[PDB]
């Protein structure tokens, strides 16, 4: 509701949520560790965190230093992804 259902990087509507940090889990969740992004941005920042080992603090889409990496990853995702593999889940 707060983000007006708009992505934080590319401004397309928002469907998922990424966690900026994991200080509190499960029982307590202040809505300042959460940002609204769409599917391509979620997958891009998910693949940016496969082997990082940063544990607590995750990627902030507001910070400009990650934007050029994220857009190149999104260009890779648009270049390479097969939709028909995502559907028909094998």
């Amino acid at each position: 509701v707060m983000d007006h259902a708009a992505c934080m990087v590319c401004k397309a509507p928002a469907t998922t949520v990424q966690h900026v940090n994991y200080r509190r889990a499960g029982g307590k969740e202040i809505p300042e560790d959460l940002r609204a992004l769409c599917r391509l941005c979620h997958d891009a920042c998910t693949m940016l965190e496969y082997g990082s080992g940063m544990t607590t603090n995750r990627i902030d889409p507001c910070d400009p230093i990650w934007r050029e990496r994220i857009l190149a990853k999104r260009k890779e995702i648009v270049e390479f992804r097969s939709r028909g593999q995502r559907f028909r889940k094998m």
């Binding site: 496969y50 082997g51 990082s52 080992g53």
Partner: protein, 54 residues
């Protein structure tokens, strides 16, 4: 290189093992952890009557 009046060893920067991640190499992370410990000790046990440089 450094100059003291009392011997201070900085071996405890590596009590946590260094795990190689996809971005950096072993050398840069080793000297980064060493820099973190050096910064923390410099901002910790520090007396104005005998300041140090290096």
């Amino acid at each position: 290189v450094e100059f003291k009046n009392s011997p201070i060893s900085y071996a405890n920067a590596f009590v946590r093992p260094v795990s190689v991640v996809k971005e950096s190499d072993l050398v840069e992370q080793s000297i980064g952890q060493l820099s973190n410990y050096v910064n923390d000790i410099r901002l910790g046990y520090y007396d104005e009557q005998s300041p140090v440089i290096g």
